[PDB]
Amino acid sequence: NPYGDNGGTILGIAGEDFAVLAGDTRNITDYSINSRYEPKVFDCGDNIVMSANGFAADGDALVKRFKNSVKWYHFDHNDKKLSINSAARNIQHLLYGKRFFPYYVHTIIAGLDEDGKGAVYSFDPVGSYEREQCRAGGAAASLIMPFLDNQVNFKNQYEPGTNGKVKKPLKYLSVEEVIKLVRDSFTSATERHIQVGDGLEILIVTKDGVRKEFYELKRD
């Protein structure tokens, strides 16, 4: 078997002027802990943060090849900043280059679109990609995304007294509120998932640049 599971869950949320990519720092094999701090969210330059979740070797290979492609793009276009959509197309081509022996990874890239709004792209191991407002990857994706849908997009929430006829209107979430929600969802996942814990690394992409925040999770 050339593949394996090293655990790990990632979360990319695109705001109106920011993008956050968060992942737990625990590396595991079966029921053992390999490392309590093995980052899987990487600033790849040009205000683009990438995370390749799944098979750790394939994730490392894909991240390395994407960084190589960004370097070659800078070599060919005179240090021109790579746009997030161009990066997404490049990652699609990189993934499809191994169609029949695929990178066993689901990768998420986050950043700002050319208009300045937060952009998040999710990729299938075979090469399909889609721009999303939010996407969760990894084992604990099912323990995190419903809560964010409830809390960011106000799903199943209605304005009180309207008899469920008026939905709760959407609102601008600041990056701080989004960070609070990410922290709470990851703490819940740590509580209920044995592969989540040991620390939460969040990379925030704004117009200023890429900002990294680390928060400790429970170590059991």
CA neighbor of 105 nearest in space, from 34, 31, 68, 50: 50
Stretch that binds other proteins, among 42-50, 56-64, 185-193, 203-211 (CB under 8 A): 56-64
Give me the least distance between CB of 34 and other proteins, in Å please: 5
The dihedrals phi and psi of 52, each to the nearest 5 degrees, come to -110, 105
Based on the shown chain and the rule CB under 8 A, indicate whether residue 11 belongs to the binding site for other proteins: no
- Whole-Å CA distances, 217 to 40, 43, 139: 16, 22, 17
Stretch that binds other proteins, among 8-16, 33-41, 175-183, 201-209 (CB under 8 A): 33-41
Stretch that binds other proteins, among 9-17, 25-33, 43-51, 168-176 (CB under 8 A): 25-33
- Residues 206/175, Cβ–Cβ less than 8 Å: yes
Binding residue (CB under 8 A) for other proteins from 16, 116, 117, 128: 128
Binding residue (CB under 8 A) for other proteins from 8, 135, 148, 200: 135
Between 96 and 150, whose beta carbon lies closer to other proteins?
96
Please give the residues from 62 up to 121 whose contact with other proteins meets the rule CB under 8 A. Answer: 64, 68, 71-73, 75-77, 79-80, 83, 85-86, 88-90, 92-93, 95-96, 99, 101
Stretch that binds other proteins, among 9-17, 54-62, 179-187, 204-212 (CB under 8 A): 54-62
Stretch that binds other proteins, among 3-11, 13-21, 171-179, 181-189 (CB under 8 A): 3-11
Strand partners, 211: 204
Sign of CA dihedral 72, 78, 79, 85: negative
Neighbour-count burial of 124, counting CB atoms closer than 10 A to its CB (0-12 exposed, 13-18 middle, 19+ buried) = middle
- How many residues in the shown chain lie near other proteins by CB under 8 A? 51
**What's the rounded Cα separation, in Å, for the pair 218 and 220?**
6
Host H or E run for residue 175: helix 175-192
Based on the shown chain and the rule CB under 8 A, indicate whether residue 188 belongs to the binding site for other proteins: no
- Residues 50/66, Cβ–Cβ less than 8 Å: yes
Task: Please report the beta strands in the chain, taking only residues with DSSP state E, as ranges in sequence order.
Answer: 9-14, 19-24, 27-29, 32-35, 42-43, 49-54, 105-112, 118-123, 129-132, 134-138, 200-205, 210-215
Q: Which residues bind other proteins (CB under 8 A)?
A: 2-4, 6, 27, 29, 32, 34-38, 55-57, 60-61, 64, 68, 71-73, 75-77, 79-80, 83, 85-86, 88-90, 92-93, 95-96, 99, 101, 122, 124, 126-130, 132-133, 135, 141-142
